[PDB]
Amino acid sequence: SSVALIVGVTGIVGNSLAEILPLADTPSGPWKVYGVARRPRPAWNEDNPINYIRCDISDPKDTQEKLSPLTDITHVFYVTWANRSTEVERCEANGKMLKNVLDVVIPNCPDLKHISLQTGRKHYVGPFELIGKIETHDPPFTEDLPRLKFDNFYYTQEDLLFEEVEKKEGLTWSVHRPGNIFGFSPYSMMNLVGTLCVYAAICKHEGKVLRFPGCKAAWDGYSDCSDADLIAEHHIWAAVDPYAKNEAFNVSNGDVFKWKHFWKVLAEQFGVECGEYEEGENLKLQDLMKGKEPVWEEIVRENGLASTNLEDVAVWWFSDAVLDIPCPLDSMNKSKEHGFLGFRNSKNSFISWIDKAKAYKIVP
Ligand SMILES: NC(=O)c1ccc[n+]([C@@H]2O[C@H](COP(=O)([O-])OP(=O)(O)OC[C@H]3O[C@@H](n4cnc5c(N)ncnc54)[C@H](O)[C@@H]3O)[C@@H](O)[C@H]2O)c1
Ligand SMILES: CC(=O)[C@H]1CC[C@H]2[C@@H]3CCC4=CC(=O)CC[C@]4(C)[C@H]3CC[C@]12C
């Protein structure tokens, strides 16, 4: 039987992996699940049969401390990251985080079969600062085209992973590059759905219109996204399928959409009146929601929500970052040609993840 390690279990995809791995019908199930994180176990992670572990993977001592006793690990799911001012600092911080984990697991786990590493569609468009500013390859992005000639901590992590798996015969790897992730995790540093839900709940409480905080290309152009549960199934599939070993795969829901339509979905789900894209405005939730923490705590008590601080639940800079730029699509041909036929209805996923945030009483 298989034993999984989820590096970043309170994450947006780690929480999906924590919910799906111990399922009875999950491939290679039953699954024993260790889940690594720093914070204490929150309230939306409590009803899963997961063996929680508190550890800062940037500290090589706590990583040797907490992970050396773990003997039975068969598969590893690295699904965390760290943000810094420049991309060079992200290469250093995230390379060391992945290295500390692998230095421990590979020798101290005799049955280690697979390591799956989650990167992203930034692999193709470049780091945050350079996005829209550098000549990329032409979309839709395919997995095995040359890397951009710029720094990128996805590149740094991939090279590291390739060297580390060599230290064990029959050790095998996979990397998964999702688009914007539709999922549920209040602790996530990039939870787009949760951020858009809070902005809709604040527009509702104030009687103001849900205005689009982005550009016309995100409003009127084609967009796609990656469902968190679908990314989890994508990890598990590559972890257990030997015809997907040592390969990089995109993972997106399989359909496109326009935030023009999704806005009315978001508007319908919170009772707000849908606003349209206003030209020559360039509205930023980071600016628009400045100093609105009292309004949030007013919403929380008036709707019996869970005790949440606006900063944790809404990452305005991320939301602004995604809606201010056009959406270049990726291709799911390589995954489908290797036998992964999973998919999601992006509209239904959006509603589904909105309703999960409502269900856990994070938004009204
Ligand atoms: N969030 C997104 O929308 C998004 C979309 C595309 C690709 N990505 C890529 O997915 C990968 C993972 O992102 P995410 O968004 O799933 O993560 P996340 O922010 O949603 O959650 C990360 C998880 O790891 C844990 N954690 C963070 N710091 C830690 C540390 N120092 N030590 C141990 N654990 C730690 C957190 O507690 C959290 O549980 C990243 O490389 C990201 O580039 C994310
Ligand atoms: C709808 C949209 O604007 C999305 C589609 C492709 C997405 C970008 C490319 C993929 C992506 C992944 C990340 O983890 C950081 C933000 C970026 C860089 C995304 C920001 C928002 C974009 C541009």
Numbering used by the authors: 26 to 389
From the primary publication:
In order to investigate the function of this protein, which we termed PmMOR (Plantago major multisubstrate oxido-reductase), we expressed, purified and determined its activity with different substrates including 8-oxogeranial, citral and 5β-progesterone. The structural studies and enzymatic assays presented here demonstrate that PmMOR is able to accommodate diverse substrates within its active site, to catalyse the reduction of aldehydes and carbon-carbon double bonds and to perform reductive cyclisation reactions to form the iridoid backbone. Each monomer of the protein folds into two domains, a Rossmann domain that binds NADP(H) and forms much of the active site cavity and a largely α-helical capping domain. The SDR superfamily generally contains a catalytic tetrad of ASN-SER-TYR-LYS or triad consisting of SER-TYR-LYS; however, the 5ß–PORs lack this canonical tetrad or triad and are thought to use only an active site TYR and LYS residue for catalysis.
